């Protein structure tokens, strides 16, 4: 599939925005 | 006009008009179980036709100077493989399109693929020949 | 001749030849069927009449 | 101009009243806009003397042109009788 | 079993008077806010909204509005006469030959009911305005006919078609097609406009 | 139709002409204003006739079935 | 083919709204009682556009009702 | 004895309040004044009233209709009828033949004064227009006041046992009645029935 | 539409149920295919109950068979339920087999109706 | 052949397993129930008689037929003197009833439409 | 009457919905999909309409003297 | 009942709503999201006075 | 379990880290949102008015 | 009354959509018809959003 960019709810980005400032993911 | 034509000319004119009016009749008969999709809008259709015309303008000198139908068909086959991959992508993205914005996005992506990658691929092909 | 008769000239019954010729004509038609009344013999301005490309195969 | 007997007398009179009512609302908006009542510099729920004079002019123009213009439109349309 | 807690609110009025954007209707001033010369009103008369669309609604209620007329009878327009203008009269007949401009009262009532259901449900979401019946709809199309044939799958939105080369050898030219710009065409784009439309025999 | 529809048309014509005449010049009534109203009525009637003609011609020339010509 | 009184009234209403919008758009009242060539051309264009828009709007309303049915 | 009948019109006439809330116990022996039209078929149940052998007479009472056909000109579909069983009354055994098929139970309702009521109701789909322009939607509505009665159950020791194959019925089997009369809202019919009550005499 | 081959995963219970309910209630399914699925559901429902009832009847008799009636209770019960288990399994398996075979036929009819199988065209 | 058609008595087949409405079925009006009517095969100008009986001559005395263990073909086999000695008249009316020679020629041999 | 109150409420709903549609500039021709920005603008416009009507109904209920016959 | 009084009440309610809508459309700015409530009320009062003066002139049986 | 899902999750986490390094915070190619996060399909598709071709 | 409500809805849709689409007063084309259809869809969706927000949202 391909969710269109205007239809792409960046849920991952949301979870990345709620992430703390020290988690390894941010380092990634 | 119709009043200025004889009987046979009126018959021929009516024949041409009726043969042109096929689709109109078929507009009345629609099927319930078919999978509806948002069609490509007229502006996107014209843009895609313009992209195809640009490709044809690029192709024309080489193929018209080619005297071998085998070579012309080889060029057509390669370009058609590329364009058919892109067409499959476009059809997949348009059939699943939820609205005209999605349909326009897909049509614009296809046109950009023709206008950006298509012209370069065609130019390399024609430089080969 | 676009589709030769010599493909199945051994047979006095032209059933395979009929099938092959109709197959070729149907390919041509699928290419050109919906442009007939706007670009070919079925146009309203018959002074601009151009032969339908699948006439010979038909 | 193909006129048929559709509404009875009372219903036709009521529909005429409704049309007059909506014409009155439209003319209210028109008089307000022409006399500059709908500006963004309104200070209170009252009309100054200039606004009242302009509104009186609007009322006079409405009164002195309604029936004559309606009759003229009737004559120029020339709807046939209903029978 | 499906009606446990599906219908809790039933009085649309009780929801109209609260959330709709309008002035409260209990203001006594509404009795005598303005002055009108109504005259004699012996029957209950209801006012219909909009400056443009009110009369049509009244025309919808009157039974005499549904008396069919032949084109010879209705041969006049408010400022135009059609009997003298033959071309305009023919165009008038053709215009009224359209099924969308001559729909019957049943069609108009069905459209009104569907639009009203859409307006009520998409606004209030009361779910009592929708059909209480659960409909299962299946297309029973007779495939044993040689004049109507549906399309298995679909006619895809776009198809790229190769123009056959060397089909015509009339004057040693292998390119049948040539666009307005003067360039020979090798490919063609075919678009499907109506998905549910049948294909002509 | 009904004569009340003619009355509605009269109301629309009157509203348009009143907006045209007194929309930008909110002055007192006069015989010149009467002449202006008559001119506006004539112009509106001519515009109505032209619009009706073109509207009916365009909606009447759209194909709806196979051409017959008897 | 026979046309109802309501359908005739609806056709007259379409004519009325098209005429009103075209007069407002093309300023046809700014004449001496007779339309200019430019105003006539603008009225013709506006009437054709109104015919197309009326047909499209009626089709859209009918399809919305049918989709409610479907 | 109070004689204050709950009105059955609108959404309550499509799905009944006792059916919707599944609280026929709270609705039993409560007067309801329902509007709708009867069907032709009649049902007889053996019963004694005041010591005289007789038959309770029931008849389907269409309280609502739904029109789900959007192809009005092409197809003339049967409307989905929401009906309840109304106990038309009691007739002695010797006069069972006197019961007429399609006979009028009571005079129909008068034409409403309001002109906006001459349209299809949003919920019941009924139009109380004596001369409906659409001849396929003409309905002669009727108002019946009666108490709500729950359906009966088989009790052989009480001598209420019915042989459906042989056509002998002693207890009100709403399920079988709906099935045999080919009614639609089978569950709503099984919920309860209305026993028509007249103001004395 | 489904993958084809030896390495492919066989239809799971969830997939079978989802496809059955899709064929029964979807709008893109013609009346003939839906009727096929409905008739599959109607006739198959008899077999499971019939098998269970037959096993219960046999095991009631088999619990008192000449050798079974003289066995200790545990072995007697196991040997008696052996007919019931076999007949119940037969009924359930036959019901599922009939229902799924006709449902798969309806799925093939749906696929051909909407042209969703390559190498299949008119 | 009227004695062959069993669709005539199909109504009674409805109520053989459904007695529920059978009594109602018995309250109908009898038109051709357990009776045979032959339409006039001749033009008889006798206004004194409203209806003319065209029952075959051998079917009139049911007693004589009630104990005879044979089909009713005796009333139809050679009971008219009328003949048409013409080559062009059709003596079969079943053009398909034939054979395709000793050499079975197809599809002539292999289709009920032709043979 | 309840029917008339419902009619007026729905008419007001339609009128203010199209008012917000015009003010928020959500009607276009490039696509039929109303973006999230336009949806939020429409929701804010509806919120402001609701606030204005709440204020008006509050002030008119306490002091009827503001609106009186003529 | 008093059908004339009911019609007058309906006319008053519709005129009230129409004038309020006109004032709201006039006094709203910045794609909505901005309006002065007291200014809206004052403009509504002014338009109510205007329509009270105009209604006898126009709204009358001919 | 550790053997199987260790290899599988090692590949999954390698993909996750690779797409984080490129600051790709959109959703992957096979994300299927719930019905509340999905765009409804527009049924109303009015076909263009039929018109005779001048050519 | 319901028919009048639906008539008002449809007429307002037509009026606003034709004001938006027919601003340059150019002759229409097939793409212009499609733009009018898109404008009608936008009007209906705006009505949906606004009315939903009015009724507890």
GROMACS .gro file of C-alpha atoms in nm, chain E residues 7 9-10 127-132, chain H residues 8-17 20 64 121-124:
model
   25
  305UNK     CA    1  -3.272   0.474   2.033
  307UNK     CA    2  -3.328   1.032   2.191
  308UNK     CA    3  -3.650   1.048   1.989
  425UNK     CA    4  -3.003   0.781   1.408
  426UNK     CA    5  -3.386   0.768   1.417
  427UNK     CA    6  -3.415   0.957   1.087
  428UNK     CA    7  -3.241   0.677   0.895
  429UNK     CA    8  -3.421   0.373   0.758
  430UNK     CA    9  -3.532   0.133   1.030
  647UNK     CA   10  -4.906   0.631   1.800
  648UNK     CA   11  -4.781   0.846   1.511
  649UNK     CA   12  -4.435   0.930   1.382
  650UNK     CA   13  -4.130   0.729   1.484
  651UNK     CA   14  -4.331   0.539   1.746
  652UNK     CA   15  -4.557   0.422   1.462
  653UNK     CA   16  -4.259   0.262   1.284
  654UNK     CA   17  -4.098   0.087   1.583
  655UNK     CA   18  -4.342   0.063   1.871
  656UNK     CA   19  -4.237   0.189   2.217
  659UNK     CA   20  -3.830  -0.076   2.124
  703UNK     CA   21  -4.596   0.239   0.871
  760UNK     CA   22  -4.451   1.152   0.667
  761UNK     CA   23  -4.081   1.135   0.746
  762UNK     CA   24  -4.122   0.829   0.970
  763UNK     CA   25  -4.449   0.653   0.882
   0.00000   0.00000   0.00000
